[PDB]
Amino acid sequence: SFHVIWIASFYKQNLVSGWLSDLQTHTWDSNSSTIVFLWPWSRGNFSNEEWKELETLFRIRTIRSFEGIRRYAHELQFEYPFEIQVTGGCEGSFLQLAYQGSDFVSFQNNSWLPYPVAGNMAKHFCKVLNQNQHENDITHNLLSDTCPRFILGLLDAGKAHLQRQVKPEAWLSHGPSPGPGHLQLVCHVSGFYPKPVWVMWMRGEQEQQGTQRGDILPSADGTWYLRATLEVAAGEAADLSCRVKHSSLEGQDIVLYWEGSLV
Amino acid sequence: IQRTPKIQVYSRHPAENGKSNFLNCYVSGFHPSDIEVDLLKNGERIEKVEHSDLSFSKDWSFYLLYYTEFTPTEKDEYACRVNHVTLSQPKIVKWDRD
Numbered sequence A: 001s002f003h004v005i006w007i008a009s010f011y012k013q014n015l016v017s018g019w020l021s022d023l024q025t026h027t028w029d030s031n032s033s034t035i036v037f038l039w040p041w042s043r044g045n046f047s048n049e050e051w052k053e054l055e056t057l058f059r060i061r062t063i064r065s066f067e068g069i070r071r072y073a074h075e076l077q078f079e080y081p082f083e084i085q086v087t088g089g090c091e092g093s094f095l096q097l098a099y100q101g102s103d104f105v106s107f108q109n110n111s112w113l114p115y116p117v118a119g120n121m122a123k124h125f126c127k128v129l130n131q132n133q134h135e136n137d138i139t140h141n142l143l144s145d146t147c148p149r150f151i152l153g154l155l156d157a158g159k160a161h162l163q164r165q166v167k168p169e170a171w172l173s174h175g176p177s178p179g180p181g182h183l184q185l186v187c188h189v190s191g192f193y194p195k196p197v198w199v200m201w202m203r204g205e206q207e208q209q210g211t212q213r214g215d216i217l218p219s220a221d222g223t224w225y226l227r228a229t230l231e232v233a234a235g236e237a238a239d240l241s242c243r244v245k246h247s248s249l250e251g252q253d254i255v256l257y258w259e260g261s262l263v
Numbered sequence B: 001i002q003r004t005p006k007i008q009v010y011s012r013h014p015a016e017n018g019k020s021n022f023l024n025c026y027v028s029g030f031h032p033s034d035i036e037v038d039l040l041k042n043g044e045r046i047e048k049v050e051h052s053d054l055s056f057s058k059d060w061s062f063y064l065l066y067y068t069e070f071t072p073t074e075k076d077e078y079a080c081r082v083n084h085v086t087l088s089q090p091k092i093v094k095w096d097r098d
């Protein structure tokens, strides 16, 4: 899936960026008002001249959208400060808008529809958003025609980067908040790509089901990080190991052992 | 509805004194997007810190990665300090290392 997000904060700050899921591929420069390509392959198979076309509606619609929101704020009952977020793309296509961090309106086929729970405010917003049917037809074609064609070229162009395999490294430490009489064993796993990973504390071949995996967290170099912790009684921390499995290791698990100066 | 930031601090590589490394502070699940995040060395603010472009998750809450290159010594303590409208006072999360 590819999508574009828009973050607009009113008190007048504006951010537009494009994404392959977690991976940022495009940014919008306000000062130049240009589309910045974050990777060589971010251009996909879109000709250099076809890229200035896309920039045009991005030109006009980004600042017509930003401008449009503030004149209507009164009748729409938007009260300062507030934030609008938009996400749109394809996988199937979608375009959704939030007001103050909650679902507000969305684009379905050919028109903007209000979320029922969002109330009459969202209804009044849709009226404005739907006042020109042609502008809605352009939105439709961007999502069901332009976005699907783009994402194919993007994935092909980036295939090398996207299917690369980067091996994890791991290490053990003491965790900060064990209960009385207990230890917290921490197994850190870092530098892996792509995201799916397996990590467990073990006693020999027995997985320790007390193993608590944290969130998978990003690194600036585009790889991932994870902490897995185990609470154990201090008497029972012998013979424990942390075992890491990842696509990139081709069956050769990383295995680290709780001991040495750790005990 | 306002959402308070989750704050997670980690290094790119195992800590080894005298070896260059990257300290990370991942702040997520917050709303509104206005936020202030500092990386601290011995309670003092670290001057050159980078961050990712602001983004948001499916549930519309925002997230940012802050990071800097650093070389730890045995005497140094690092932390991430976060201020947000949801917070009575700046919240400080230490980098835990042995």
Ligand SMILES: CCCCCCCC/C=C\CCCCCCCCCCCCCC(=O)N[C@@H](COP(=O)(O)OCC[N+](C)(C)C)[C@@H](O)/C=C\CCCCCCCCCCCCC
Pocket: A004, A005, A006, A016, A017, A018, A026, A027, A028, A035, A036, A054, A061, A062, A064, A065, A066, A067, A068, A069, A086, A088, A089, A090, A095, A097, A128, A129, A131, A132, A135, A139, A142, A143, A146, A147, A150
């Ligand atoms: C970093 C970029 C990367 C790009 C990569 C591209 C490759 C893939 C391409 C596409 C993938 C899908 C992207 C989805 C984009 C969807 C576009 C959204 C349509 C915006 C509707 C404009 C309405 C307008 O522009 N609305 C103007 C109307 O001005 P007007 O005077 O034309 O109205 C008169 C109409 N009549 C002629 C009938 C009288 C404004 O006054 C209204 C309402 C304002 C509220 C608009 C804000 C909400 C818009 C939500 C989107 C905003 C940002 C989206 C871009 C990020």
